[PDB]
Design a protein around this ligand. Structure first.
Ligand SMILES: [Mg+2]
Ligand SMILES: [Mg+2]
Ligand SMILES: [Mg+2]
Ligand SMILES: [Mg+2]
Ligand SMILES: [Mg+2]
Ligand SMILES: [Mg+2]
Ligand SMILES: [Mg+2]
Ligand SMILES: [Mg+2]
Ligand SMILES: [Mg+2]
Ligand SMILES: [Mg+2]
Ligand SMILES: [Mg+2]
Ligand SMILES: [Mg+2]
Ligand SMILES: [Mg+2]
Ligand SMILES: [Mg+2]
Ligand SMILES: [Mg+2]
Ligand SMILES: [Mg+2]
Ligand SMILES: [Mg+2]
Ligand SMILES: [Mg+2]
Ligand SMILES: [Mg+2]
Ligand SMILES: [Mg+2]
Ligand SMILES: [Mg+2]
Ligand SMILES: [Mg+2]
Ligand SMILES: [Mg+2]
Ligand SMILES: [Mg+2]
Ligand SMILES: [Mg+2]
Ligand SMILES: [Mg+2]
Ligand SMILES: [Mg+2]
Ligand SMILES: [Mg+2]
Ligand SMILES: [Mg+2]
Ligand SMILES: [Mg+2]
Ligand SMILES: [Mg+2]
Ligand SMILES: [Mg+2]
Ligand SMILES: [Mg+2]
Ligand SMILES: [Mg+2]
Ligand SMILES: [Mg+2]
Ligand SMILES: [Mg+2]
Ligand SMILES: [Mg+2]
Ligand SMILES: [Mg+2]
Ligand SMILES: [Mg+2]
Ligand SMILES: [Mg+2]
Ligand SMILES: [Mg+2]
Ligand SMILES: [Mg+2]
Ligand SMILES: [Mg+2]
Ligand SMILES: [Mg+2]
Ligand SMILES: [Mg+2]
Ligand SMILES: [Zn+2]
Lengths: 208, 83, 138, 99, 125, 104
RNA sequence: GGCUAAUCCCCCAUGUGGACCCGCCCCUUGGGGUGUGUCCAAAGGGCUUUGCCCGCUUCCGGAUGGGCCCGCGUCCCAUCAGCUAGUUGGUGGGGUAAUGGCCCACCAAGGCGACGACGGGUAGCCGGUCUGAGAGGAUGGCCGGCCACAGGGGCACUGAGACACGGGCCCCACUCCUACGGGAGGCAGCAGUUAGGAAUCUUCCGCAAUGGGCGCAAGCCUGACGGAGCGACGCCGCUUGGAGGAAGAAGCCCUUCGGGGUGUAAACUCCUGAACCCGGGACGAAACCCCCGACGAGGGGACUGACGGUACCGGGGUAAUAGCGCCGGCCAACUCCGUGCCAGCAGCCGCGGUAAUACGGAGGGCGCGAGCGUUACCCGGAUUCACUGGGCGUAAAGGGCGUGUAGGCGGCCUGGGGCGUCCCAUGUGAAAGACCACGGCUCAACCGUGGGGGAGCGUGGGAUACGCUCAGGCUAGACG
C-alpha cells in the first residue's frame, strides 16, 4: 500500500516544499519553515555536488511523492504517457492529474491528497452518479465529481467545502460549492500546473 | 458436417460467443471457417447480438446446420423471417 | 581498368575539391554526364563541359567552394561536404519509392537511377519511383 | 474391463470373411477369362468375362471394392481379354465388349 | 571481408560458455559434504576460508564456499549449492546456501539475513 | 500456374529423360548482393526430341517417375555447349579436391 | 449340434442413370460428349395411417474435410569428401481413391555432390514470444494451426475415413493371476500414488451454459467443458488510516558538552471506518419441447442453473499486517563501537595486519513495498562476428612466391529482349497476439466491437536509367 510514515520529512529531503498535508503545511510549521534540510544525523553538513543520477533521481522522487503514488503505478503511467501522441512530459502530468484522488483534492473536497485518497476509498465520492472508490480511477473530461448524498453531512466534508466558499479552482475544473459538485472540464496542461518539477529530468531518468 | 454454432470467446464469468461456421469436428474454440455474428448472453451493452443474415442465409443454403441455440439467435436476427 | 567508373568520378571530384582545384577531368560517359547534370542543378558544382584530352572525351567539372575564412586555415568551406558511392558492383543497392533515404534531413541529396531516368531522391519521390541508389551527396 | 464395443471386432471378423470370399471369386474368374482369351477360345472366354464383370460391379455394390477399384478391375480385364483374343487371331463371338 | 566473402563464409555466431556446471542448467543443486576443509586465499589475501567438497545429485563432486561467521557442516552434512565464484580461492565456483538442509543459518545475524538464512529476531515479541 | 522453368540440357544420357540445369539469381537475404544459384531437373522427353546443349523450358507436371516431375515444354534456342561446358568443368574439378587435388 | 428375425446377406427384374472395352466428335496428360456391346440399384420403420414423418437406391452438383505433387524458405561440424545398385531412367505389370521404383520382371547405365552430396550432432515446425533505435539475437511455454507418438518393434482387418491412445495379431521387456497346461495388463485422458528433482496443485462441483456422439423425440452418454480448490507463481486493483498535534516527551544514537538526530514521528484530540455482523439477492436461460398456425414464417406456453446464497445492493461497525535489499567507487544513501591480513566481505576494482563510510552491530539514511533479495538462463549494453556497423606496418590478423581452374568483378557508343530492378491493380497474408478508437466489469488487469498497417508469394498491366542478355561498332584497358 501507499507510503505512510512521516511526511514533512520527504519535504525536507526533496528540498522543495511538498504539500502532503492540509492546513498545517501552511501554518508556520511544515518543517521546511523550521529546519529546511534533509532528515537524519547529517542533515546539516555540507552537500556534495549531486551526480547526474542524483539529480534525475530526486526530480522523479519529488514529482512522484507529490501525488503520493507508488513507483509501480507511477512508472506504468509514465510508460503510457510515453506511448501516446504529444509531448510526454505534459501528457504524463495530465494523466497523474486525472487520478480521481487528485481531482477530489483539486476540488477542495479534501484538505490534502492523502485525505482525498481516503475519501474515495470510503466511498464518500461519486463520479457521474455511480460511486467510485478507486484512488487510481481516471477522471475524463466531462465527468461530474460530487460528494456522496449520504456523506454530504460529514462534519469534515462540511468543514472543507465550507472553506471552499471563496477559493477559486483550476481552469480545467469547475466547482459548485452549492451542491458539492465539481466538473472535470479538460486535461490540465503544463502551463496550468505549477509543480516544482522539471519534467525534462524525469523523462531522462527513465531514459537510462 | 459444417455447422453454424457458438464459440466461447469471453473470459471467466464474462462469456461472449462468436456465431460461427465450422466443420462439426473442430474444437469448439478451434479454427472456424467464417465468423458470421456475435452474441453477448448477458446483454452488457445494447448491441449484444449482430448476425449478418445475408451470410447466414448463404451457409444455410449450402448445408450449414445450426446448433439449437445458434438457430435461436439466427432466428431472433430475422434469418428465417420470410414474410 | 576501372572496376567502377561512377565511384571513380565521385572520387576525382572528392580529391580535387579537397585541394581546391578549379576544374577537374573525368573520362566521359553518358551516365556520368547524367549524374553531373544533377550535381550542377543542385548547385554542388559550377557546372561541367565536354572537352577533349589526348584525343579522348572527358568532362571538365567546374568545382565551387564557399568563401575565404577567418583565423588560422582560412580555407573555404566546401560546397560538397560529403559524396559517397552507395550502389557498387559485387554489391548493388535498389530501393522502392518508399525506401528512398532522406539525406541529412533533406539538406543533402541522393541520386537514384530509375527507369524514368537519373533523379534525386525528391525528383524520384515525386515521379513516385525507385531504383538503384547510386550515391549520396551533402 | 469389457467395453461392449467388442461387438465391433466381432462384426469386423464377419465382414472380413465376407469380402475375403467375394474377392477370390473375382480373381479366379478373371484369370479364368484371361486364360481362355489366351487360348483363343472366343465364346467361353467372353462368357466368363461377363461373370467377372458382374461380380466386380457387384462387389462395388457394397463396400468390398466400390467405384474406381472395380472400374480399374473391369478395364484391366476387358483390356487383357481383347488383346489376347485379337493376338490369338480370334473373332469376338458375342457377349460383352463393345466391339 | 569483402561482401563476396561474407556471402561465401558469413559471420560466426558467438557461443556462450557456462561458468557453473550445476548440470540441468539448474538454479541450485543439492549434494553431500565429503570434506569440510579450510582454505587459504591467494595473491594478496590471507585468511582461512571455509570450503567444502560436495558430491552433487548432478553427479559432480565440487568444492563450495561456506559464507557466514561460523557453520555446522560435518562430513555428511548434505546441502544446497547455488553457484558464485570466490575470487580469492581459485577453483571455488559455488556457494553453499545457509538456511537449507543441514546448513544452519548464521547465528546472531541481524542485517543482510535474507542471505545467511537467519529468521527475523523476535523483537516484535 | 504450373511452374515454367528455363535451363540448359546438360545431359541426354537417359531414355526419354533430359537433365535441365535451371539457373536463378536473387539478393542475398542479409548481404543484399545479388547471387546466382542453380538446380538440375530431370525433365521428361518422350520423343528424345531434345539434345545436349538445347535451352529448353520445363513445365511442372504430374509425376512421371520418382525424381521426374517436369516435362520439356519447348525449345528456346538450340545448341550452345558454352553453357554445358561450364557445367562439365565444374564437375571435372570435383574429382580432385578430395584426397589429392584438382587443377589450377 | 439344433431352431430363428430384420433396415443382416444373396438371386432375378426395372436402368432415370452410372461403370468398362471399342469407335467418332470437341477438348487437351486420365476433361466433356456420343453409338453399339457387356455390367450394376434399393428396406424398411412410425403414425394425429390413402397420407405425413423417419429411412433406403442410382446419378449429377454443392459444401466441408482430406491424399498426392511442385517453387522458394528452414540449426551445428568439412577434424564428415566423395555418396548411390531399386540405385537413376525406360518398357510392361502389380498396387491405390490417385500420380509415382510405391512394388515387381525385363532393359538401359545411369542419378547426387564443394550452390556441400554422404556422414555425425542437436531439434517437432509455425502464428508468435523475449530483447533490441533498428538490423539482428534468443526462443516456440500458455493459446491457435500443422506434424508425430500412445510400454518398444512389426502387421493388417473392418470401415467414407485407421494401420486405429481407452480395437485386433505377432515378437520383446516389465507387472499381475495360475492347479505350470495357460491367462491378464499399459494414465503421453481427469484426479491421484510413487520415483527422480532446486521445483510444478484437488483421488473437488456440475452437465445449468457452449460444443460433441446416438435418437422422430423425450432423453442418454460427455474428467470436452463451465466452475470451485491449492501455490504472492505472474499481472492488475486495494488496505495497514485521515486532519490536527512542541522551536519540540521518553528511550536509543551522535557531540567540539553549547547542542544535534530519530520527529509530527509518538503520546494525545477529533474524523472516516477494511475486517466482521444483519437484511435483500442476480445476470449468465431460452431454446429443444407443447399449443395455435401447414411439423414452415410467425405467435403463445412450459422446464432448466454447478458456480452461490457467491457478485452486487442496503443497514450496522472495529484505527485495524510491514517487510526486504542496500549506504567505498560504478550507485541514491555516514557516523559510533567492536574487530586487528583475524573473523570476514567480494559483481569488478578491491577492503581487513589498532582513526576501516568496504568486515559485525548499532544510530541514521537511500531504494522498493506484500513484497524484497539471491541463484539460473535469454536479449541488451557489445560497432566484442561489425548487413546496418570492425579490422590486419609495430596491438590478434597478409597466405613464403608464383602459375592458374571454378567463382566474384568488368572500358566507350548504338539497337533488340525485359531476367535482376522500379511502378500500378488484384489474390493471399485465419483467429489469437501487436497498433488505434469506442465500449463491458466501480478502475485496472482481463474482455467485446470496430478501424489501421503488414513482409513474402501468385496473377494482370507498364517503365528501361542501372545490372543482365543478345546483336553491332569503337580504341583510352590488354595483348602483338
Ligand atoms: Mg509521448
Ligand atoms: Mg546499403
Ligand atoms: Mg452397438
Ligand atoms: Mg588483503
Ligand atoms: Mg553485506
Ligand atoms: Mg450351428
Ligand atoms: Mg443391405
Ligand atoms: Mg437412358
Ligand atoms: Mg440387376
Ligand atoms: Mg525405390
Ligand atoms: Mg544448387
Ligand atoms: Mg527430442
Ligand atoms: Mg544494439
Ligand atoms: Mg538487413
Ligand atoms: Mg470407414
Ligand atoms: Mg469408419
Ligand atoms: Mg465405421
Ligand atoms: Mg464407411
Ligand atoms: Mg468402424
Ligand atoms: Mg465410417
Ligand atoms: Mg461407415
Ligand atoms: Mg462408419
Ligand atoms: Mg476397406
Ligand atoms: Mg459406409
Ligand atoms: Mg481408438
Ligand atoms: Mg489409457
Ligand atoms: Mg452438457
Ligand atoms: Mg448439448
Ligand atoms: Mg497523522
Ligand atoms: Mg553516492
Ligand atoms: Mg577473530
Ligand atoms: Mg576502528
Ligand atoms: Mg558495501
Ligand atoms: Mg559496515
Ligand atoms: Mg500490488
Ligand atoms: Mg551485436
Ligand atoms: Mg562491415
Ligand atoms: Mg577490432
Ligand atoms: Mg602481430
Ligand atoms: Mg608477403
Ligand atoms: Mg576467370
Ligand atoms: Mg558494363
Ligand atoms: Mg522484368
Ligand atoms: Mg500484395
Ligand atoms: Mg470503461
Ligand atoms: Zn510539509
Amino acid at each position: 500500500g501507499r507510503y505512510i510514515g512521516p511526511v514533512c520529512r520527504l519535504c525536507r529531503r526533496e528540498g522543495v516544499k511538498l504539500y502532503l498535508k492540509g492546513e498545517r503545511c501552511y501554518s508556520p510549521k511544515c518543517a521546511m519553515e523550521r529546519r529546511p534540510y534533509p532528515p537524519g544525523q547529517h542533515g546539516q553538513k555540507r552537500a556534495r555536488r549531486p551526480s547526474d543520477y542524483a539529480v534525475r533521481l530526486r526530480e522523479k522522487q519529488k514529482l512522484r511523492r507529490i501525488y503520493g503514488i507508488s513507483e509501480r503505478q507511477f512508472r506504468n503511467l509514465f510508460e503510457e504517457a510515453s506511448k501516446k501522441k504529444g509531448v510526454t512530459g505534459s501528457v504524463f502530468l495530465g494523466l497523474l492529474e486525472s487520478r480521481l484522488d487528485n481531482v477530489v483534492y483539486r476540488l477542495g473536497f479534501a484538505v490534502s491528497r492523502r485525505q482525498a485518497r481516503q475519501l474515495v476509498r470510503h466511498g464518500h465520492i461519486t463520479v457521474n452518479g455511480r460511486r467510485v472508490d478507486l484512488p487510481s480511477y481516471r477522471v475524463r473530461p466531462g465527468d461530474e465529481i460530487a460528494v456522496a448524498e449520504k456523506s454530504r453531512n460529514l462534519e469534515l466534508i462540511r468543514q472543507n467545502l465550507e472553506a471552499m466558499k471563496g477559493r477559486k479552482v483550476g481552469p480545467w475544473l469547475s466547482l459548485d460549492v452549492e451542491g458539492m459538485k465539481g466538473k472535470f472540464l479538460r486535461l490540465p496542461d503544463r502551463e496550468d500546473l505549477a509543480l516544482p518539477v522539471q519534467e525534462n529530468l524525469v523523462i531522462e531518468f527513465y531514459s537510462r | 458436417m459444417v455447422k453454424i454454432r457458438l464459440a466461447r470467446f469471453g473470459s471467466k464469468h464474462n462469456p461472449h460467443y462468436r456465431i460461427v461456421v465450422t466443420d462439426a469436428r473442430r474444437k469448439r474454440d478451434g479454427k472456424y471457417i467464417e465468423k458470421i455474428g456475435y452474441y453477448d448472453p448477458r446483454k452488457t451493452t445494447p448491441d449484444w447480438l449482430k448476425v449478418d443474415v445475408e451470410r447466414a442465409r448463404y451457409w444455410l443454403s449450402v448445408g450449414a446446420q445450426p446448433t439449437d441455440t445458434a438457430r435461436r439467435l439466427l432466428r431472433q436476427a430475422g434469418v428465417f423471417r420470410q414474410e | 581498368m576501372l572496376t567502377d567508373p561512377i565511384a571513380d568520378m565521385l572520387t576525382r571530384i572528392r580529391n580535387a575539391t579537397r585541394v581546391y582545384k578549379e576544374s577537374t577531368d573525368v573520362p566521359a560517359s553518358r551516365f556520368k554526364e547524367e549524374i553531373l547534370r544533377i550535381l550542377a542543378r543542385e548547385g554542388f558544382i559550377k557546372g561541367y563541359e565536354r572537352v577533349d584530352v589526348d584525343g579522348k572525351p572527358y568532362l571538365r567539372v567546374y568545382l565551387k567552394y564557399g568563401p575565404r575564412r577567418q583565423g588560422p586555415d582560412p580555407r573555404p568551406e566546401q560546397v560538397i561536404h560529403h559524396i559517397r558511392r552507395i550502389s557498387k558492383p559485387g554489391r548493388r543497392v535498389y530501393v522502392g519509392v518508399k525506401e528512398i533515404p532522406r539525406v541529412r534531413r533533406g539538406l543533402g541529396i541522393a541520386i537514384l537511377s530509375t527507369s524514368k531516368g537519373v533523379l534525386t531522391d525528391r525528383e524520384a519521390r515525386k515521379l513516385g519511383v525507385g531504383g538503384e541508389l547510386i550515391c549520396e551527396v551533402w | 474391463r469389457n467395453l461392449s464395443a467388442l461387438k465391433r471386432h466381432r462384426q469386423s471378423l464377419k465382414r472380413r470373411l465376407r469380402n475375403k470370399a467375394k474377392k477370390s471369386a473375382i480373381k479366379t474368374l478373371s484369370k479364368k477369362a484371361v486364360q481362355l482369351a489366351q487360348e483363343g477360345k472366343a465364346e467361353e472366354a467372353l462368357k466368363i468375362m461377363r461373370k467377372a464383370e458382374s461380380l466386380i460391379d457387384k462387389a462395388a455394390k457394397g463396400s468390398t471394392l466400390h467405384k474406381n477399384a472395380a472400374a480399374r478391375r473391369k478395364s484391366r480385364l476387358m483390356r487383357k481379354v481383347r488383346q489376347l483374343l485379337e493376338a490369338a487371331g480370334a473373332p469376338l463371338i458375342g457377349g460383352g465388349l463393345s466391339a | 571481408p569483402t561482401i563476396n566473402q561474407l556471402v561465401r563464409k558469413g559471420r560466426e555466431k558467438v557461443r556462450k560458455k557456462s561458468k557453473v556446471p550445476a548440470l540441468k542448467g539448474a538454479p541450485f543443486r543439492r549434494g553431500v559434504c565429503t570434506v569440510v576443509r579450510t582454505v587459504t586465499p591467494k595473491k594478496p589475501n590471507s585468511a582461512l576460508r571455509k570450503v567444502a567438497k560436495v558430491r552433487l545429485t548432478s553427479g559432480y563432486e565440487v568444492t563450495a564456499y561456506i559464507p557466514g561467521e561460523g557453520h555446522n557442516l560435518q562430513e555428511h552434512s548434505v546441502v544446497l549449492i547455488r553457484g558464485g565464484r570466490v575470487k580469492d580461492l581459485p577453483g571455488v565456483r559455488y556457494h553453499i546456501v545457509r538456511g537449507v538442509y543441514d546448513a544452519a543459518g548464521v547465528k546472531d545475524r541481524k542485517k543482510s539475513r535474507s542471505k545467511y538464512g537467519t529468521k527475523k529476531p523476535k523483537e516484535a515479541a | 500456374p504450373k511452374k515454367v522453368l528455363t535451363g540448359v540440357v546438360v545431359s541426354d544420357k537417359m531414355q526419354k529423360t533430359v537433365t535441365v540445369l535451371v539457373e536463378r539469381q536473387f539478393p542475398h537475404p542479409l548481404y543484399g548482393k545479388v547471387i546466382k544459384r542453380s538446380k538440375k531437373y530431370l525433365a521428361h522427353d518422350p520423343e528424345e526430341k531434345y539434345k545436349l546443349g538445347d535451352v529448353v523450358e520445363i513445365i511442372e507436371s504430374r509425376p512421371i517417375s520418382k525424381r521426374k516431375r517436369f516435362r520439356v515444354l519447348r525449345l528456346v534456342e538450340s545448341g550452345r555447349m558454352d553453357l554445358v561446358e561450364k557445367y562439365l568443368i565444374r564437375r571435372q574439378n570435383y574429382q580432385s579436391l578430395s584426397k589429392r587435388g584438382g587443377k589450377a
